[PDB]
Amino acid sequence: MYRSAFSVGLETRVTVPNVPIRFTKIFYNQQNHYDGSTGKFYCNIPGLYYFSYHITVYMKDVKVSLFKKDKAVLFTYDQYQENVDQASGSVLLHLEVGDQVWLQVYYADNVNDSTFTGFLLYHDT
Amino acid sequence: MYRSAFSVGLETRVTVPIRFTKIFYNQQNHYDGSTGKFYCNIPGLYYFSYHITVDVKVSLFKKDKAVLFTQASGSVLLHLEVGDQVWLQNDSTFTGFLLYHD
Amino acid sequence: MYRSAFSVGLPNVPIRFTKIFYNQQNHYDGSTGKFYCNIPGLYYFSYHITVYMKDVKVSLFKKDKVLFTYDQYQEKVDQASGSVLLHLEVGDQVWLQVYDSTFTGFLLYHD
C-alpha cells in the first residue's frame, strides 16, 4: 500500500445542495482516486487519511458536511458577516477499501473557490 | 517509529487544556481525553491543525508554553520529543499526526 | 528523496511570513516569502491569515497563481484559510498572496 491523494476546487459560483459537490478544478489527482464525475473520493488503500476543506461563505450562512460511506462525519457551520469567509474543516479518518468521502452543503451560491483535499497519511500494514 | 495521529472534536462548550471527547481518530491512543493532551511517543515533525468554535483567544501549547495565539484556526509544524505534549487552551476539531520521524 | 517542510506565521506581493515555527531544510525563504522546491513531489500547503482588506482575494501562487475563479464582482475580506495539494517540480515556487496567521507546507509524496 502506498499513495492516494487529491486536491480539488470549485470553479462554478453555485452548487446544487444536499448532494456531493462536484469540484472541477483539479489541483492534483494523480491516481485518479477523486471521481470528478461524482465529487467523491474512493478509498483503494485502507489507512489513515487527512481531509481538509474550505467552503466559501459570502452573504449566506454555510453548513457543510464531510460524508464518509453514507453519512455525515464532520459538520461545519459558518455564519456570514457584512465578508468572505471559509467554512473550513480538517479531520483524520481511517478508511477501508470502498469507503468514499465527499462534501455537501445543506442552489448554494458563492461557493466558487471552495476546496476539498485529502491524502493517505499512513497505509494499513 | 511510524504512526502517531489523532483527530478529536468538541461535544460541548467551555473552550486549562480543552478536553476533546469526540474521537474521529485516535488509533495509537496518543491523545488523552482525560487531560486533553497529545503525548509525543515518537520524536519527529508533527503537523497540528484545529478549527475551534469558542474576546476569546485560543492557544496551542507545546510542553507548557503557548506556540500559537489564534472561530479560531491554526495549523503548524512542531518538532516534538518523546514526553512533549501538545494541547489547546458545527464540529471543533483538534488534529495532529507524525509527519517525519526523527 | 524525503523531507521538505516549513511552518511560518505573522497585497499583490508574496506575504513575507517572518515568525518561523519550522524551516529545517530552509526551503522557505523568509526574505522573499516564497517556498522553493528542491525535491519534486506532492506537497501539502495550508494557511490561515488575517487580511482586513476590501475587494481582495487570497490564494496560493505557484509560478504565479493556483485557483483563479472567473466570477462577477462583489465585496470584502477579513481573514482567509486554504489548503491544497500541489505536485511541484524542482525550481517551482509557492507562496501566499492576497492577489497568529500561519502558512505551512510539507512534502508528502516524493517522486
CSV table of C-alpha atoms in Angstrom, one decimal:
chain,number,residue,atom,x,y,z
A,1,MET,CA,0.0,0.0,0.0
A,2,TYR,CA,1.3,3.5,-0.9
A,3,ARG,CA,-0.2,6.7,-2.3
A,4,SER,CA,-3.6,8.3,-2.6
A,5,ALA,CA,-4.4,11.9,-2.6
A,6,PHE,CA,-6.4,14.5,-4.4
A,7,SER,CA,-6.9,18.3,-4.1
A,8,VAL,CA,-9.7,19.9,-6.0
A,9,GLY,CA,-11.6,23.2,-6.1
A,10,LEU,CA,-14.9,24.7,-7.2
A,11,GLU,CA,-14.8,27.0,-10.2
A,12,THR,CA,-18.6,27.3,-10.5
A,13,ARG,CA,-20.2,30.0,-8.5
A,14,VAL,CA,-23.2,27.9,-7.5
A,15,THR,CA,-23.5,24.2,-6.5
A,16,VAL,CA,-26.7,22.1,-6.2
A,17,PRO,CA,-27.5,21.4,-2.1
A,18,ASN,CA,-27.8,18.1,-0.3
A,19,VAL,CA,-25.6,16.3,-2.9
A,20,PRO,CA,-21.9,15.7,-3.4
A,21,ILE,CA,-20.1,18.8,-4.6
A,22,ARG,CA,-18.5,18.0,-7.9
A,23,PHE,CA,-15.3,20.0,-7.7
A,24,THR,CA,-13.9,20.5,-11.2
A,25,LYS,CA,-10.7,22.4,-10.7
A,26,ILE,CA,-8.2,19.6,-10.2
A,27,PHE,CA,-5.1,20.8,-8.3
A,28,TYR,CA,-4.0,17.2,-8.0
A,29,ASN,CA,-5.5,13.7,-8.7
A,30,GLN,CA,-2.6,11.6,-9.9
A,31,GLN,CA,-4.1,8.2,-9.1
A,32,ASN,CA,-7.5,9.4,-10.0
A,33,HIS,CA,-8.9,8.5,-6.7
A,34,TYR,CA,-11.1,11.5,-6.8
A,35,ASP,CA,-14.0,10.9,-9.2
A,36,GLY,CA,-14.7,14.2,-11.0
A,37,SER,CA,-18.0,12.8,-12.3
A,38,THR,CA,-19.3,12.4,-8.7
A,39,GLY,CA,-17.3,14.6,-6.4
A,40,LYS,CA,-16.4,11.5,-4.4
A,41,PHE,CA,-13.1,10.2,-3.4
A,42,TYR,CA,-12.8,6.4,-3.3
A,43,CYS,CA,-10.5,4.6,-0.9
A,44,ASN,CA,-8.4,2.0,-2.7
A,45,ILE,CA,-5.8,1.7,0.0
A,46,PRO,CA,-7.0,1.2,3.6
A,47,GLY,CA,-5.3,3.6,6.0
A,48,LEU,CA,-5.5,6.9,7.8
A,49,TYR,CA,-6.5,9.8,5.6
A,50,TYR,CA,-6.3,13.5,6.2
A,51,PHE,CA,-9.1,15.6,4.7
A,52,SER,CA,-9.1,19.3,4.6
A,53,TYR,CA,-11.8,21.5,3.1
A,54,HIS,CA,-12.9,25.2,2.8
A,55,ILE,CA,-16.3,26.3,1.6
A,56,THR,CA,-16.6,29.9,0.6
A,57,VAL,CA,-19.0,31.9,2.7
A,58,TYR,CA,-20.5,35.1,1.3
A,59,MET,CA,-23.7,36.7,2.4
A,60,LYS,CA,-25.3,33.4,3.4
A,61,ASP,CA,-24.6,31.1,6.3
A,62,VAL,CA,-22.9,27.9,5.2
A,63,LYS,CA,-23.5,24.4,6.5
A,64,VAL,CA,-21.1,21.8,5.2
A,65,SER,CA,-20.8,18.1,5.9
A,66,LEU,CA,-18.0,15.8,5.2
A,67,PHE,CA,-19.5,12.5,4.3
A,68,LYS,CA,-17.9,9.0,4.6
A,69,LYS,CA,-19.6,5.9,3.3
A,70,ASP,CA,-23.2,7.1,3.5
A,71,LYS,CA,-23.2,9.5,6.4
A,72,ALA,CA,-22.1,12.9,7.6
A,73,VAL,CA,-18.9,12.5,9.7
A,74,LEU,CA,-17.9,16.2,10.2
A,75,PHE,CA,-20.1,19.3,10.2
A,76,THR,CA,-19.1,22.9,9.7
A,77,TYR,CA,-21.4,25.9,10.2
A,78,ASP,CA,-20.2,29.3,9.5
A,79,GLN,CA,-22.4,32.5,9.8
A,80,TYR,CA,-21.7,35.2,7.3
A,81,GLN,CA,-20.9,38.9,8.1
A,82,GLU,CA,-21.4,42.2,6.4
A,83,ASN,CA,-17.1,39.4,4.2
A,84,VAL,CA,-15.9,36.3,2.5
A,85,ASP,CA,-15.1,33.6,5.0
A,86,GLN,CA,-14.4,29.9,4.7
A,87,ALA,CA,-16.4,27.2,6.4
A,88,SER,CA,-13.4,25.0,7.0
A,89,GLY,CA,-12.7,21.6,8.5
A,90,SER,CA,-10.0,19.1,8.7
A,91,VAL,CA,-10.1,15.7,10.1
A,92,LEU,CA,-8.3,12.3,10.2
A,93,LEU,CA,-10.4,9.4,9.2
A,94,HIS,CA,-9.3,5.8,8.9
A,95,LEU,CA,-10.8,4.4,5.7
A,96,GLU,CA,-11.4,0.9,4.5
A,97,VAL,CA,-11.3,0.0,0.8
A,98,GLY,CA,-14.7,1.0,-0.7
A,99,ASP,CA,-15.2,3.9,1.7
A,100,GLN,CA,-16.0,7.1,-0.3
A,101,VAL,CA,-15.9,10.6,1.1
A,102,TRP,CA,-17.2,13.8,-0.3
A,103,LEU,CA,-18.6,17.1,0.8
A,104,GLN,CA,-22.2,18.5,0.8
A,105,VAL,CA,-23.8,21.9,1.6
A,106,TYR,CA,-27.1,21.6,3.4
A,107,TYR,CA,-28.9,26.3,-5.2
A,108,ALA,CA,-25.9,27.2,-2.9
A,109,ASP,CA,-24.4,30.4,-4.3
A,110,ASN,CA,-21.0,32.0,-4.0
A,111,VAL,CA,-19.3,28.6,-3.4
A,112,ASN,CA,-16.7,29.2,-6.1
A,113,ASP,CA,-13.0,29.0,-4.7
A,114,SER,CA,-14.2,26.3,-2.2
A,115,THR,CA,-11.6,23.5,-1.9
A,116,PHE,CA,-11.6,19.8,-0.9
A,117,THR,CA,-8.3,18.0,-0.3
A,118,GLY,CA,-7.5,14.5,1.1
A,119,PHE,CA,-4.5,12.2,1.3
A,120,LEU,CA,-3.4,8.8,2.5
A,121,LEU,CA,-1.2,9.5,5.5
A,122,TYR,CA,-0.5,6.0,6.9
A,123,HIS,CA,-1.4,3.0,4.9
A,124,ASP,CA,-2.7,0.0,6.8
A,125,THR,CA,0.0,-2.7,7.1
B,1,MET,CA,8.6,4.6,14.6
B,2,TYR,CA,6.0,5.5,12.1
B,3,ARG,CA,2.4,6.2,13.2
B,4,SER,CA,1.1,8.7,15.7
B,5,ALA,CA,-2.0,10.7,14.8
B,6,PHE,CA,-5.3,11.9,16.3
B,7,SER,CA,-8.3,13.9,15.4
B,8,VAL,CA,-10.8,14.7,18.0
B,9,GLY,CA,-13.7,17.2,18.4
B,10,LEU,CA,-15.8,19.0,21.0
B,11,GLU,CA,-19.0,17.6,22.3
B,12,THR,CA,-19.7,20.8,24.4
B,13,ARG,CA,-18.7,24.4,25.0
B,14,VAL,CA,-16.2,25.8,27.6
B,15,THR,CA,-13.1,26.3,25.4
B,16,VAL,CA,-6.9,24.9,31.1
B,17,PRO,CA,-6.5,22.2,28.3
B,18,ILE,CA,-9.5,21.7,26.1
B,19,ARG,CA,-10.8,18.2,26.6
B,20,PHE,CA,-12.0,17.0,23.2
B,21,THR,CA,-14.0,13.8,23.8
B,22,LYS,CA,-15.3,13.2,20.3
B,23,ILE,CA,-12.9,10.8,18.6
B,24,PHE,CA,-12.6,10.8,14.9
B,25,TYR,CA,-9.3,9.1,15.1
B,26,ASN,CA,-7.0,8.0,18.0
B,27,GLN,CA,-5.7,4.6,16.9
B,28,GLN,CA,-2.5,4.7,18.9
B,29,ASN,CA,-4.2,6.3,21.9
B,30,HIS,CA,-1.7,9.1,21.9
B,31,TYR,CA,-4.3,11.7,22.5
B,32,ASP,CA,-5.6,11.6,26.1
B,33,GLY,CA,-9.1,12.7,26.5
B,34,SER,CA,-8.9,12.8,30.3
B,35,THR,CA,-6.2,15.5,30.1
B,36,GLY,CA,-6.8,16.8,26.5
B,37,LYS,CA,-3.1,16.5,25.8
B,38,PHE,CA,-1.5,14.6,22.9
B,39,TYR,CA,1.6,12.8,24.1
B,40,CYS,CA,4.6,12.5,21.8
B,41,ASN,CA,5.8,8.9,21.7
B,42,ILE,CA,8.0,9.2,18.6
B,43,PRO,CA,10.3,12.2,18.1
B,44,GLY,CA,9.9,14.0,14.9
B,45,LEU,CA,7.9,16.6,13.0
B,46,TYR,CA,4.2,16.8,13.7
B,47,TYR,CA,1.5,18.7,11.9
B,48,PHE,CA,-1.3,20.1,14.1
B,49,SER,CA,-4.4,21.7,12.8
B,50,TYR,CA,-7.5,22.9,14.7
B,51,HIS,CA,-10.8,24.6,13.9
B,52,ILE,CA,-12.4,25.6,17.2
B,53,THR,CA,-15.6,27.5,17.8
B,54,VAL,CA,-15.5,29.5,21.1
B,55,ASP,CA,-13.0,38.4,23.4
B,56,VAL,CA,-11.8,34.8,23.4
B,57,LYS,CA,-8.3,33.8,22.2
B,58,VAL,CA,-7.2,30.2,21.6
B,59,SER,CA,-3.7,28.9,22.2
B,60,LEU,CA,-1.9,25.8,21.0
B,61,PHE,CA,0.6,24.7,23.8
B,62,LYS,CA,3.7,22.6,23.3
B,63,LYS,CA,5.3,21.4,26.6
B,64,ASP,CA,3.9,24.1,28.8
B,65,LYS,CA,4.1,27.3,26.6
B,66,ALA,CA,1.8,28.8,24.0
B,67,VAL,CA,3.1,28.3,20.5
B,68,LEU,CA,0.1,29.8,18.7
B,69,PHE,CA,-2.3,32.5,19.8
B,70,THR,CA,-5.3,32.5,17.5
B,71,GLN,CA,-13.8,30.6,15.3
B,72,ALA,CA,-10.1,30.2,15.9
B,73,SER,CA,-7.9,28.4,13.3
B,74,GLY,CA,-4.3,27.4,13.0
B,75,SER,CA,-2.1,24.7,11.5
B,76,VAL,CA,1.6,24.3,12.4
B,77,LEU,CA,4.6,22.0,12.3
B,78,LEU,CA,6.2,21.3,15.7
B,79,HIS,CA,9.2,19.1,16.0
B,80,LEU,CA,8.4,17.1,19.1
B,81,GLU,CA,10.4,14.9,21.5
B,82,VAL,CA,9.1,11.9,23.5
B,83,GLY,CA,7.3,13.3,26.5
B,84,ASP,CA,6.4,16.5,24.7
B,85,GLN,CA,2.6,17.3,25.0
B,86,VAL,CA,0.5,19.4,22.7
B,87,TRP,CA,-2.9,20.8,23.6
B,88,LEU,CA,-5.3,23.7,23.0
B,89,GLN,CA,-6.4,26.3,25.6
B,90,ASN,CA,-20.6,22.6,13.9
B,91,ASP,CA,-17.6,20.5,14.9
B,92,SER,CA,-14.5,22.0,16.5
B,93,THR,CA,-11.6,19.7,15.7
B,94,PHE,CA,-8.0,19.3,17.0
B,95,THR,CA,-5.8,17.2,14.8
B,96,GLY,CA,-2.2,16.0,14.8
B,97,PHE,CA,0.0,13.5,13.1
B,98,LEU,CA,3.6,12.4,12.9
B,99,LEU,CA,4.9,13.7,9.5
B,100,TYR,CA,8.6,12.8,9.6
B,101,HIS,CA,10.0,10.6,12.3
B,102,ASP,CA,13.3,11.8,13.9
C,1,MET,CA,14.1,11.9,-1.5
C,2,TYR,CA,12.1,12.6,1.6
C,3,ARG,CA,11.9,15.7,3.8
C,4,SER,CA,10.9,19.3,2.9
C,5,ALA,CA,8.7,21.4,5.1
C,6,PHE,CA,8.1,24.8,6.8
C,7,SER,CA,5.6,26.4,9.1
C,8,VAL,CA,5.6,30.1,9.3
C,9,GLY,CA,3.5,32.9,10.6
C,10,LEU,CA,2.8,36.5,11.4
C,11,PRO,CA,-1.4,43.0,-1.4
C,12,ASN,CA,-0.4,41.7,-4.8
C,13,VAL,CA,3.0,40.6,-3.5
C,14,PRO,CA,4.2,37.5,-1.7
C,15,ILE,CA,3.4,37.6,2.0
C,16,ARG,CA,6.6,37.6,4.0
C,17,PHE,CA,6.0,35.4,7.0
C,18,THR,CA,8.8,36.2,9.5
C,19,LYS,CA,7.7,34.1,12.5
C,20,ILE,CA,9.5,30.8,11.8
C,21,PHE,CA,7.9,27.8,13.6
C,22,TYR,CA,9.8,25.4,11.3
C,23,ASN,CA,12.1,25.7,8.3
C,24,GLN,CA,14.7,22.9,8.8
C,25,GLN,CA,15.5,22.4,5.2
C,26,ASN,CA,15.4,26.2,4.7
C,27,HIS,CA,13.3,25.6,1.5
C,28,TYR,CA,11.2,28.6,2.6
C,29,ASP,CA,13.0,31.9,2.1
C,30,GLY,CA,11.7,34.4,4.6
C,31,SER,CA,13.3,37.3,2.7
C,32,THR,CA,11.1,36.6,-0.4
C,33,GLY,CA,8.2,34.8,1.4
C,34,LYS,CA,8.5,32.0,-1.1
C,35,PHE,CA,9.0,28.3,-0.7
C,36,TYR,CA,11.4,26.7,-3.2
C,37,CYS,CA,11.1,23.2,-4.4
C,38,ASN,CA,14.2,21.1,-4.3
C,39,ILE,CA,12.6,17.7,-4.1
C,40,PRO,CA,9.9,17.1,-6.7
C,41,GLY,CA,6.8,15.6,-5.3
C,42,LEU,CA,3.4,16.1,-3.9
C,43,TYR,CA,3.3,18.9,-1.2
C,44,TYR,CA,0.5,19.9,1.1
C,45,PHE,CA,0.1,23.6,1.9
C,46,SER,CA,-2.3,25.1,4.4
C,47,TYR,CA,-2.8,28.6,5.6
C,48,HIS,CA,-4.9,30.9,7.8
C,49,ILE,CA,-4.1,34.7,7.6
C,50,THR,CA,-5.6,37.9,8.8
C,51,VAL,CA,-6.2,40.3,5.9
C,52,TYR,CA,-8.5,43.2,6.6
C,53,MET,CA,-8.8,44.4,3.0
C,54,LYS,CA,-11.6,45.1,0.6
C,55,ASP,CA,-12.3,43.7,-2.8
C,56,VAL,CA,-9.4,41.3,-2.3
C,57,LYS,CA,-9.0,37.5,-2.8
C,58,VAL,CA,-6.4,35.2,-1.2
C,59,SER,CA,-4.6,32.3,-2.8
C,60,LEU,CA,-1.5,30.2,-3.0
C,61,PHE,CA,0.6,31.1,-6.0
C,62,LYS,CA,2.9,28.8,-7.9
C,63,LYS,CA,4.9,30.2,-10.8
C,64,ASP,CA,2.1,32.7,-10.3
C,65,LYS,CA,-1.5,31.5,-9.1
C,66,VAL,CA,-3.3,28.3,-8.1
C,67,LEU,CA,-7.0,28.8,-8.0
C,68,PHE,CA,-8.5,31.6,-10.1
C,69,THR,CA,-12.2,31.7,-10.4
C,70,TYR,CA,-13.8,33.9,-13.1
C,71,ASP,CA,-16.7,35.5,-11.4
C,72,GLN,CA,-18.9,38.6,-11.3
C,73,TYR,CA,-17.8,41.4,-9.0
C,74,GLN,CA,-19.0,41.7,-5.3
C,75,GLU,CA,-17.1,42.9,-2.0
C,76,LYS,CA,-14.8,42.3,1.3
C,77,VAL,CA,-12.2,40.2,3.3
C,78,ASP,CA,-11.0,39.9,7.0
C,79,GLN,CA,-9.3,36.5,7.4
C,80,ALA,CA,-8.7,33.7,4.9
C,81,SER,CA,-7.9,30.0,5.1
C,82,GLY,CA,-7.0,27.4,2.5
C,83,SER,CA,-5.2,24.2,1.9
C,84,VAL,CA,-4.2,22.5,-1.3
C,85,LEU,CA,-2.1,19.7,-2.6
C,86,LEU,CA,0.3,20.6,-5.4
C,87,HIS,CA,2.8,18.4,-7.2
C,88,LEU,CA,5.9,20.5,-7.5
C,89,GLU,CA,8.9,20.2,-9.9
C,90,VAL,CA,12.4,21.3,-8.9
C,91,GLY,CA,12.6,25.1,-9.1
C,92,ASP,CA,8.9,25.6,-8.5
C,93,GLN,CA,8.0,28.3,-6.1
C,94,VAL,CA,4.9,28.6,-3.9
C,95,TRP,CA,3.8,31.4,-1.7
C,96,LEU,CA,0.7,33.0,-0.3
C,97,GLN,CA,-0.5,36.2,-1.8
C,98,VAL,CA,-3.6,38.5,-1.4
C,99,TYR,CA,-3.8,38.9,-5.2
C,100,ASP,CA,-1.0,34.4,14.6
C,101,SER,CA,-1.5,33.8,10.9
C,102,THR,CA,0.0,30.7,9.6
C,103,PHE,CA,1.4,29.2,6.4
C,104,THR,CA,2.6,25.6,6.4
C,105,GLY,CA,3.8,23.4,3.6
C,106,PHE,CA,5.2,19.9,3.5
C,107,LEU,CA,6.5,17.3,1.1
C,108,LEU,CA,4.2,14.3,1.4
C,109,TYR,CA,4.9,12.0,-1.6
C,110,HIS,CA,8.3,12.4,-3.2
C,111,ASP,CA,8.7,11.5,-6.9
